[PDB]
Symmetry: D2
Subunit: 257 residues, 4 copies
Amino acid sequence: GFLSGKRILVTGVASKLSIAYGIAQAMHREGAELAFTYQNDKLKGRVEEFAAQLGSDIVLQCDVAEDASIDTMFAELGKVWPKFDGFVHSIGFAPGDQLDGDYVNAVTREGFKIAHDISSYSFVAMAKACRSMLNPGSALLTLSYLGAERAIPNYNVMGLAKASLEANVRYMANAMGPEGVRVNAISAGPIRTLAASGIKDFRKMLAHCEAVTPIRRTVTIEDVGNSAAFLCSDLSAGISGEVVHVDGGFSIAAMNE
Amino acid sequence: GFLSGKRILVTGVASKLSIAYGIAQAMHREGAELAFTYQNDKLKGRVEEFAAQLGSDIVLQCDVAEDASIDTMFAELGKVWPKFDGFVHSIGFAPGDQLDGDYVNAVTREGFKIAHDISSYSFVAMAKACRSMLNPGSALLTLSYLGAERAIPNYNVMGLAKASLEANVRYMANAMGPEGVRVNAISAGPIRTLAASGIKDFRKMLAHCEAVTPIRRTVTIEDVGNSAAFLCSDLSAGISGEVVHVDGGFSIAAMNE
Amino acid sequence: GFLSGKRILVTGVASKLSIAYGIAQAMHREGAELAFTYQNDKLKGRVEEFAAQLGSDIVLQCDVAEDASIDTMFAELGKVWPKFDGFVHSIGFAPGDQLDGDYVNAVTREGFKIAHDISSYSFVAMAKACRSMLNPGSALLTLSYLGAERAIPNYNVMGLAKASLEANVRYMANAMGPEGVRVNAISAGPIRTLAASGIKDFRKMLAHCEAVTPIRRTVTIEDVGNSAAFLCSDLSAGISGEVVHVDGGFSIAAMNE
Amino acid sequence: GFLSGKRILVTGVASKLSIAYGIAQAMHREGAELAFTYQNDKLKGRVEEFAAQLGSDIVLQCDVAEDASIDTMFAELGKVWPKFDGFVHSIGFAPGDQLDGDYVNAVTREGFKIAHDISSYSFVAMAKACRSMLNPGSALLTLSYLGAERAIPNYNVMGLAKASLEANVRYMANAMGPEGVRVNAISAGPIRTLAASGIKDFRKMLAHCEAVTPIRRTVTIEDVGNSAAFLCSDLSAGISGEVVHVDGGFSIAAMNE
Ligand SMILES: [C]C1=[C][C]=C(S(=O)(=O)N2N=[C]C3=C([C]=[C][C]=[C]3)[B@]2([O])O[C]2[C]([O])[C]([C]OP(=O)([O-])OP([O])(=O)O[C][C]3O[C](N4[C]=NC5=C4N=[C]N=C5[N])[C]([O])[C]3[O])O[C]2[N+]2=[C][C]=[C]C(C([N])=O)=[C]2)[C]=[C]1
Ligand SMILES: [C]C1=[C][C]=C(S(=O)(=O)N2N=[C]C3=C([C]=[C][C]=[C]3)[B@]2([O])O[C]2[C]([O])[C]([C]OP(=O)([O-])OP([O])(=O)O[C][C]3O[C](N4[C]=NC5=C4N=[C]N=C5[N])[C]([O])[C]3[O])O[C]2[N+]2=[C][C]=[C]C(C([N])=O)=[C]2)[C]=[C]1
Ligand SMILES: [C]C1=[C][C]=C(S(=O)(=O)N2N=[C]C3=C([C]=[C][C]=[C]3)[B@]2([O])O[C]2[C]([O])[C]([C]OP(=O)([O-])OP([O])(=O)O[C][C]3O[C](N4[C]=NC5=C4N=[C]N=C5[N])[C]([O])[C]3[O])O[C]2[N+]2=[C][C]=[C]C(C([N])=O)=[C]2)[C]=[C]1
Ligand SMILES: [C]C1=[C][C]=C(S(=O)(=O)N2N=[C]C3=C([C]=[C][C]=[C]3)[B@]2([O])O[C]2[C]([O])[C]([C]OP(=O)([O-])OP([O])(=O)O[C][C]3O[C](N4[C]=NC5=C4N=[C]N=C5[N])[C]([O])[C]3[O])O[C]2[N+]2=[C][C]=[C]C(C([N])=O)=[C]2)[C]=[C]1
């Protein structure tokens, strides 16, 4: 496949509904060698199981809240992947109280802080820590949301964190391009799922989106995974510092009703 | 390849330096069946020759200045491709007097008109004419330039035409998504070439670009072709109405010096 | 008045409800000396009457479709204002057939032509004609619509025209900057009126807007007039090449329902 | 004055050269009643003196790092202004180590934290504290920089902070709109000063700008003050959630050299 020869590290797998699961599957199908991380002991077994299904046994703990955890993970990856071709950052977080109702009333100093630490800083943290082990032609990827560009109900502070993330993509791209590294983000649409969200009234969001999206449907983790694989392959060599909208055209339309 | 089974029509091939040549090569490598058009008798033989090299013998005349030429071409394609999976619009034009010096002084009613007719209207003209023969899952693609988003010296009126083009992409995406059609544009960087441009002081443009581009180089028709092939494949199903910047991050940086 | 000592030329007044009327009223209130042009005989008296109310007797014909018309209007204007300080361009026209239905179907070569010629080229056309009559510190203004940036049902090719116009603003800005001239555009939201708009199902556009607009109402020609006055005044000295949205935060929110 | 009958609170005055000083001067000139806050004891007298010149004796301390500080400042402010009409937020801070060199290297968890906390969260923090003291028709203003939108050498994490701030503007705009409050930001260009900036090789930023800025000069706190006054006045009633660029067309041109 177009990823054959590539050794990628994938984060934020938590279930078969996880965007990163979809990305992992796709990258594997295009012939990449994958490594996985997990946040805690609660997820360890699920990921190990998924890993194995995708021919991997490089499963490491990483909680991006702790620089030490990041360092230690990269230290262990190195034993087996002294050098590698990048990573997919699919992590995010904020306290629930934060995503409910009036943004001004909801937001707090600490929530803002957490949302931004986990959801935005963490991406560069990882780059900072594995910078030396990345190969030229390596690609870093993160996932964002329209929430960052427009004010979305209930999305509240994640909107801010995402905007920070997308700026991060650009500052990182600029900093690392000269050494062979490309950095982009995929801004995906709300994915239709069964589970339950943090975004309040997500179910509606999905409903409305399908009706007014040019392609007339929500996207899938497949849709998202296919773009990520491309964006992480040498086929995208000319693209860096970009936020690609994978939302079936939702963002470019208006008043479709 | 990821384009296997796909029947694409490619325009604007004029030489081995043509962006569309690069797109054609790439699409062919990913297993698509290609058809070509040519503007006039002066180019007919070169294209026929390229076509053959890419296993095609569907070479038709099309001058997008004439609706009749468009209709007639689509009529003939139909004999052999009653239905097909889209097309790549890589056409553009403006009178030379137009791209030299102060924009206000240079621009004229007629130049503006021509630039916009050929460079922007032509894309929807083609869609209008082959709408009925497109298959669900079909993808339409055009090529644009930063010139459309920023004021670029000498680029003058093409800048306007390009802005019209990029708006066209969105209006077309919105109109055709519901029937299975996706429409995007690639905004490519200035490509390093030997030939001579219409854009005055292009050589400099290339020079400056390489120095301040995050990847530290100009892109290639390969870079561009690889993105187009992806954007025309089912791998991009979740992307429509988008203007993807394939310029190695040039647009996202500033004052790099 | 912050406009005191300015001679500004106002285009496209056609009723007490026209956006240009509101721009005129504000400018006059802020101390500007005004002049008016009208499109054709049928509007002569009306405009002649408004002008009276606005303490002016400078009323000329000008059909932007004709270069000679523009040359002449300025030739005449200069008999009384050999130098002035900016002209407000509130003009645009598409054939109605163009504004209803599927863009791709509705669109036509001629329709496209006319829309851009009148709605876009015209703005530079006038700049070009009075360039030497302008004083340092002059400012040119035009009026856009969100349709330039997003696909909006029925707006169709007007959307492409506006996009072209907004690109014009920057090119013009970049060319006349060094000689003391600023060029900007105001992108107004839909203004609730009683008459009938050439734009299809506009009433609904109105209803929807107020509900989801952050300020919870539609803007007035008053609101628009005021921003207009400011942008043509020395108070906006640091602003050029700008598309200022004056639509109550509408373009920035998403899924407010 | 178009600000007559308004009570506006001004933040971040630290010298005669501070952007807030210029915003104050303009607002005062346009008839606004002003109040000031200072960060710490070391600035008390200075601000107390400016205020005097600006016909005010409302001078309070406020360190946005502390919620209690904000609560108290407003508690005190309310003894004299139980209701007012908007506060101007001209505050931001990063640790210097952060602003020099390779972003990825320079950056650090704490640096990132502080930058966003002070430069971004603070703005909503204040909104949140005086929300009930605000009159219908109030307006909040903040100051950004192009670094939010583009990667700029050395600006580094401040770039992420600003991006976060600009997202805040929209979220805030969308939340307080219905209750009569507008929120906007002015993205100013680099202002030529004599002192020394915490920002690295800034002088050069200055030199470069004037050369390539469409108006061919840097903006003044005067230019910025004026736009500021307007945006906090009823004249800008139709404007909310907006990032107005006040940098002489700089962000819009490309390759002017
Ligand atoms: C409260 C809350 C939480 C969280 C959040 S986040 O994450 O951020 N998100 N989510 C979801 C969503 C979103 C958006 C929209 C919609 C939805 B977001 O905002 O973003 C997202 C993210 O980023 C990504 C992913 O997602 P998904 O796949 O879905 O997810 P999950 O499965 O859950 O996963 C996640 C992950 O992460 C991790 N972490 C956390 N924390 C941590 C971690 N790691 C390490 N460390 C630490 N500390 C966990 O574990 C998991 O695994 O993508 C995105 N998106 C985008 C777009 C769209 C989407 C959808 N879904 O549709 C998604 C918020 C709130
Ligand atoms: C004067 C002048 C002319 C022209 C023009 S255009 O075309 O538009 N262009 N070119 C170039 C350039 C540009 C931009 C930038 C740079 C450069 B533009 O603006 O755009 C472009 C286009 O669109 C496309 C393509 O290109 P290329 O590939 O290079 O080209 P060629 O080879 O030349 O080819 C073209 C074509 O077309 C055709 N046509 C015409 N006309 C017509 C036609 N067809 C049909 N009909 C009619 N009527 C011919 O024949 C040929 O084949 O892409 C683009 N780009 C973008 C970006 C970048 C680039 C580079 N190169 O770098 C490109 C202008 C002015
Ligand atoms: C069918 C058609 C379509 C369109 C047109 S227009 O003009 O272009 N428009 N209208 C309306 C509207 C719009 C948009 C949106 C909405 C609505 B549009 O597109 O735009 C507009 C314009 O531009 C301006 C102003 O308007 P108004 O004021 O409303 O209107 P009127 O009153 O009618 O005025 C106009 C004018 O122009 C003129 N012209 C024409 N042609 C010509 C002229 N002049 C000279 N020459 C020539 N050739 C007449 O006469 C008159 O005065 O603004 C805009 N806007 C924007 C935004 C918003 C708005 C509202 N309304 O809301 C508006 C056409 C047709
Ligand atoms: C090292 C560092 C960095 C940064 C900062 S900041 O503030 O942030 N900045 N600065 C400067 C600049 C910028 C940008 C660009 C350029 C330059 B930034 O980033 O920003 C700015 C700001 O925001 C505003 C204002 O500024 P200015 O006026 O210039 O300054 P000053 O005078 O110094 O002021 C400030 C203020 O703040 C305050 N704070 C702090 N912290 C705190 C406070 N308060 C309270 N609390 C707390 N905690 C002090 O005190 C003072 O007063 O604007 C801006 N900008 C924009 C644009 C442009 C510009 C110019 N300059 O050009 C500016 C820091 C550090």
